[PDB]
Amino acid sequence: YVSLADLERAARDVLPGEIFDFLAGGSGTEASLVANRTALERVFVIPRMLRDLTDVTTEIDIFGRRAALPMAVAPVAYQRLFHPEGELAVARAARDAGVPYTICTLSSVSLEEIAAVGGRPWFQLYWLRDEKRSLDLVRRAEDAGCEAIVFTVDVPWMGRRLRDMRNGFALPEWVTAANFFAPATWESVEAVRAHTDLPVVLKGILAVEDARRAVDAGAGGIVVSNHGGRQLDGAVPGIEMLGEIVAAVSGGCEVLVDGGIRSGGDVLKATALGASAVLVGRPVMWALAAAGQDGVRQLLELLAEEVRDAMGLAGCESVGAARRLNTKLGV
Amino acid sequence: YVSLADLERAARDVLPGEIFDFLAGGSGTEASLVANRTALERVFVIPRMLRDLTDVTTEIDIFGRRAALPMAVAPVAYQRLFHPEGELAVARAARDAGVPYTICTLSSVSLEEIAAVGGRPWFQLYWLRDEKRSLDLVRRAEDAGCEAIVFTVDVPWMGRRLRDMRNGFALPEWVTAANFFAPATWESVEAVRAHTDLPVVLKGILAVEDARRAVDAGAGGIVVSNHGGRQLDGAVPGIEMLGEIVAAVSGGCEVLVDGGIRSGGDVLKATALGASAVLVGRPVMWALAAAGQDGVRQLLELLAEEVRDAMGLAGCESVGAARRLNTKLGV
Amino acid sequence: YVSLADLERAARDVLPGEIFDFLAGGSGTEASLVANRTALERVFVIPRMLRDLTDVTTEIDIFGRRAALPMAVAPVAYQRLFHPEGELAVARAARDAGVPYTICTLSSVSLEEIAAVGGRPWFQLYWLRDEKRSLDLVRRAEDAGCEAIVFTVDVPWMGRRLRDMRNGFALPEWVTAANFFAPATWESVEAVRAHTDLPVVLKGILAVEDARRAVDAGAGGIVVSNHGGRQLDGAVPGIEMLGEIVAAVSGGCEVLVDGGIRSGGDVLKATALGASAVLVGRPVMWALAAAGQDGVRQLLELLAEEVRDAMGLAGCESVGAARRLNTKLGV
Amino acid sequence: YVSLADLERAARDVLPGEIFDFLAGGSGTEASLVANRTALERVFVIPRMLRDLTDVTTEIDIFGRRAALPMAVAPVAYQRLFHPEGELAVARAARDAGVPYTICTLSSVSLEEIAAVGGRPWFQLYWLRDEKRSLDLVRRAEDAGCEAIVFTVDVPWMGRRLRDMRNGFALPEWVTAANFFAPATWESVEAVRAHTDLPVVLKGILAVEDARRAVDAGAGGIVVSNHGGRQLDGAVPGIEMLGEIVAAVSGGCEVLVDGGIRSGGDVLKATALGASAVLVGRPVMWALAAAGQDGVRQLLELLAEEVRDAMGLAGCESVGAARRLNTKLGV
Ligand SMILES: Cc1cc2nc3c(=O)[nH]c(=O)nc-3n(C[C@H](O)[C@H](O)[C@H](O)COP(=O)(O)O)c2cc1C
Ligand SMILES: Cc1cc2nc3c(=O)[nH]c(=O)nc-3n(C[C@H](O)[C@H](O)[C@H](O)COP(=O)(O)O)c2cc1C
Ligand SMILES: Cc1cc2nc3c(=O)[nH]c(=O)nc-3n(C[C@H](O)[C@H](O)[C@H](O)COP(=O)(O)O)c2cc1C
């Protein structure tokens, strides 16, 4: 594989159509899904030349841990849909690559089993029916060694997935929510923040004042995101809000972004717009479907090579230097 | 049906081509018809997160009545062209859905029969040869229980419908103007305003100063509209004038918009740009052609679900909150 | 024919390919040819409503004469290429329609014969080898009753017509320059201005300061034009310079525009951007090729109907009102 | 050949696919490769009329020598890949056309042999493992009569050429680096500047402050360039940075540009944006592949004719006048 696009083909070949559609699809007309890519393709980097590249490093420190790349694996529910080893395969490859892995509330392997793999696990929280059971998942995650709580805030309910509706898609009986819902509010965030010493990261922020409020609320990070175009159809891409959000929080929390990151060059664009790190979702599942743990390993090695390549070609010996790059929007 | 686009296909299958063309077409090169859709697709919403959604309501109060959605059925002439029950089928479904229905001057069932269905009927006025007969239609409408007069102001004459001209389209003899024309001016508006206690709504306003003058003239509302691209070919889409018009009237009248609204997400966009409500035209006729009253019921249920979905995903418990959303224009 | 596009098809059918290419083509990659259309399609009009349309008139006064439309037939060389009656057919139809006709220096019928048709003939000048012979053409034109000299200023030499080069196109022996070249300068303009009492109109102005200088030089008009994309490939469309040019000359001369005008709606756009009038080139030749004098008559009747339609739908009882319309650029 | 596009076809026919791909391709997704063309196509020139064109000249003085056009042949490695005479064929044609030829560090004929052809040779430097051997190439070039050192600064390493990777492309054994690498820094530039009296030209500058620093560092010129989209995928096109760079250096060095120049009109655009001259890469190799030295001669004659044509049509008797043209960005 010489690009991430190589893996999507392989995944399309092996996966049942309705499962590929569950993975690929978005809500409504998929306007926001498409816009995530459009928006990245309009960004051009202004590279710097003639700088010292003797020790280029793609490493970052985030939420108290070194990561090998400014990247984590996005939360993706029910990974056994894509390969029999599901979350274990992905978590093992992420660990070996030095990349944080986000364990889902709706994981198809229990969070404790996935955490036992080691590495840098984060835990993604969906708010439950009750504060006490929500906080129990959080406590489980913390007890198991997860190092951040990624509280997803853009799913008061699931968006309208028309591919799933037309396919009559349902979870096969051989996939379960192995850790076993209500709309979250700012009160829910405070309940979580008070219940853990772990950094709380709010995933799904797009409005500048919600980013500001996240910092005021004690969040250690946010993910600027429209949930891969799966939630509000017509939601602005995170990448188009990122610069304004980074300016507004002025270093008060980590600012991650996701949606359509498909190469090391895309990681560089995100960094140049001010992101601390990116999440990558669908491509990690393509790699998992295509070739299991080894597939995910190959994807992460490819991404690592592309990130180093893009950084050096842009004159950046560190991710902090890449954040100081300027950009120019094209057509 | 999981989207409005499902219904257009069914309508295309059942309707005679020249009738489908009468419905689908625009004037001239159909530049304004296409631009209505382009313009909506360029609008992205910036959703808010973590707000209280315990009692999301899509209801609005407009022209003295509660409506179930920020939506009314647009005036569409000669609905028996599309189904034998014509206006009665549509009016019944609108009533049952809690949506206002606009009875046309050129209705193929008399305005009194359609009003007898109940619900929230509005009446759309085309200015006639003479002030006295124009005012008679208005008086008929008011006597029959219509609750607003939608005075169409962008048809001094009918636009050049090239599909109709190439098809040699004419009303079949089995369709008549069951209520049975000159250019309207501001004097005509005043004649109507003086003749009724009902709110007068000027449909087809695009210039900011015409919106201002509408308020000065005593209009209770305007519809920002290029008549679905059927009148001036090259007229700006209403959605591209809406924000500027809403700012200029500064609460002095209701500001509705139409043209290309095809989903609950589109309703949300219109609301976020400042609209009080939208009108929906062609899709209601697709539903009527495809499946009569039941078809229109299904369309309105779908739209209601999509509007509630979009509002909640955008953090809006009410339509007023949706009007306070920000937007960002894309490419 | 219900549109100008109807006629192009007919012309394509009847004309030898190399002659159709001579007519349709532009210079270089035809970037400017295409951009003339792109640019018009991006312009949207903001129509006014509810104005008095009791006596809508499309007439204008220009260069001392009433014209039936804000339009003239552009200079097009060698019209016998397209029909045996050539310039006589076009001039007769223009006369009957009340539209000025521009007689070319490179006409295939002598300027005196074409002037004898009557109507409102203008004369287009290409600067010759010598001042004295140039001025002789001007004097011939004036003696024959031409009412303006349209001095073409964007052809120091003919552009690179790659269609013509690939076709090995040459004038057939049955077409001649019946009135029988060096780069023109501002000195040439002054020589012409001093030699005639007729208004001198500079055709091919695109730079704002060249428009200003044209007024200073005593021009009665300019045509803002990139010569239909036939001269500099990459020249900005006239329609994209028009508003800035109209503002800069501030009523000091008539400002016409051409390039891609293909409907009455396009005439309205040009007027709303500030043009006094438009020229129309290729469509008049399509009509000539398709059906001779009668074809040109039909085209001009169609354009007249479309101009009246567009004006009234936009709330304009006169061309001066249409010049006060606002516009909004789309995508 | 009536355009540069004629030659690409011929080259595609004759060259082995993997060699055509080596020539045509870019890095990554080829976003920057495509953007070079997009960016040029969006630029429109505002031509001037009625100026004296009695002695139009396309000549410029640059780096102490007259050149026949504001153009040089870009450095392209390993030209024997495209024709058996390789660099000798191209250098001979460039000499005969009065165009500088850039001899590459990775030339497939020795720099001394190519310099012996005569003409105006420049020498392109890739920084080597060691300062002393780097400076030896520079000294060789100067001894052999090269008149500028074009130090390529955007290749700390070669970009990711996915076409080459998928083709498994490697140099055939019949092509060698006949003159026989580490990342260059500003220290390397100073080492070169101190080692030669020749002007040093930094090729691959895109950031405005790198252009400023180039002048401060004693560079005689820069080439604003993204290396033909072959280095950082997502790097902004040089043509989109050119105007800002020209303003920032304020005459302190020559500012060249390359990337996608494919006609005399493109040369005019570059000049109007402020370039001193352009480089042309791939088209020169198309001509070489198609027809050897004679092919390159034909290409340069065509470009010369197109440049003269574009300049005169734009009212420019000199390249300095063309630099004073205004432009307008289109869609
Ligand atoms: C199949 C699938 C399942 C997902 N499940 C979750 C989830 O359980 N929790 C969550 O916060 N995001 C979930 N996401 C959203 C991703 O974390 C991410 O925001 C999105 O995929 C955008 O990134 P991408 O374009 O790289 O896929 C899911 C996305 C996909 C495609
Ligand atoms: C077939 C058809 C008939 C219409 N008849 C009327 C009419 O009688 N009066 C009126 O004011 N608008 C009329 N309209 C315009 C609509 O009210 C509305 O402005 C337009 O269709 C744009 O909305 P849409 O894109 O949702 O169809 C008609 C539209 C269509 C398509
Ligand atoms: C076949 C042809 C011949 C033309 N001959 C002349 C000419 O002799 N003199 C002139 O000033 N313009 C000439 N023009 C330019 C036109 O007057 C006009 O500027 C151009 O066609 C743009 O208008 P259009 O898009 O309506 O064709 C010619 C154009 C065409 C297509």
Ligand SMILES: Cc1cc2nc3c(=O)[nH]c(=O)nc-3n(C[C@H](O)[C@H](O)[C@H](O)COP(=O)(O)O)c2cc1C
């Ligand atoms: C096959 C090929 C080889 C090249 N080799 C070199 C090189 O050795 N040194 C260099 O500075 N640029 C090299 N370049 C870049 C060119 O000098 C130039 O920047 C680029 O091709 C953009 O111009 P174009 O679009 O006219 O090809 C090469 C380009 C190509 C296509």
Ligand SMILES: O=C(O)[C@@H](O)C(F)(F)c1ccccc1
């Ligand atoms: O985007 C997703 O699929 C998840 O975030 C979800 F939580 F919304 C979800 C999980 C499982 C099935 C449908 C939606």
Ligand SMILES: O=C(O)[C@@H](O)C(F)(F)c1ccccc1
């Ligand atoms: O857009 C429409 O079709 C109506 O608004 C109309 F009034 F213009 C009309 C009604 C019937 C036939 C043609 C136009």
Ligand SMILES: O=C(O)[C@@H](O)C(F)(F)c1ccccc1
């Ligand atoms: O655009 C044109 O064809 C004319 O304006 C011309 F004068 F340039 C010309 C006339 C006849 C043949 C080629 C060009």
Ligand SMILES: O=C(O)[C@@H](O)C(F)(F)c1ccccc1
């Ligand atoms: O763009 C290029 O091909 C050259 O500039 C290069 F130096 F990068 C190079 C030369 C030979 C093989 C691969 C890259």
